[PDB]
Amino acid sequence: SAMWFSWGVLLNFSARILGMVWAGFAMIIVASYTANLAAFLVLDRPEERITGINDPRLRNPSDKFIYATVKQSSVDIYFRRQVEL
Amino acid sequence: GELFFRSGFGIGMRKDSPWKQNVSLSILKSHENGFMEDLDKTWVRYQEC
Amino acid sequence: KLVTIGSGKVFATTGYGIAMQKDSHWKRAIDLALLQLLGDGETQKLETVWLSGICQNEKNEVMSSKLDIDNMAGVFYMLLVAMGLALLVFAW
Amino acid sequence: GMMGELLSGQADMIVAPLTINNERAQYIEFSKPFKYQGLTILVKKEIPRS
């Protein structure tokens, strides 16, 4: 009867009015969930690693960031000679 | 919202003068309590929008 | 996951100083040199080198804790309105 | 200006938003700063408006 219509209202006397206002509620909640998820999958983006050599993570070593170069190379000399590195 | 060359407003006087130390101490005391905050509320933080 | 209340905007707003013995003759030269360093931007370089945390202040918009008070309030509003309409139909 | 008036003896104290810097400190002595603030840029909201 009208029970299935309820389930289907989302897609398809005063009982029809109540069904209409309930369908409006259904549409508004679906739009709300859509906007929520759209903001969800946009805002989450971990850039973390900064392209810079001036990144604070590189300047301050920590357990979660491990970085190194080839031993006994030009990079080793370059990092050795500068006292601020 | 940017800022550069952060500096301060102080009170100028001549070379070594009797009022220097007490002026500095009074300013520090006013900073310690809320007097400078009261002045900021009265003159700077009163906005119309 | 740590943030400060605003940014130190209603508080004592003092500064770090170099303590010296009273009547020391180093005070004039030290204050002049500190003012020169502050004006030249070397102090800003030091702040960049040392007082710099993860990226910037990391506003990061909404990291977590989704807020949807408008949606639930509207939900309850519609349910109450519907039940009131049903009660009005009962009245007739 | 105010620096010249103070140094010439016309005044005994400058009670004004006078910025502390090394150029002025070589000739006069400032108190501890009663305000902390930097330089900034003033503009308008859009060409006419949003």
Ligand SMILES: *[C@@H]1O[C@H](CO)[C@@H](O[C@@H]2O[C@H](CO)[C@@H](O)[C@H](O)[C@H]2NC(C)=O)[C@H](O)[C@H]1NC(C)=O
């Ligand atoms: C600066 O403030 C100090 C506060 O200690 C003043 O020193 C006192 O001055 C009164 C003047 O009547 C004397 O009776 C006290 O014996 C002083 N005490 C000390 C510890 O010095 C000082 O006079 C003030 N200077 C100026 C120029 O106002």
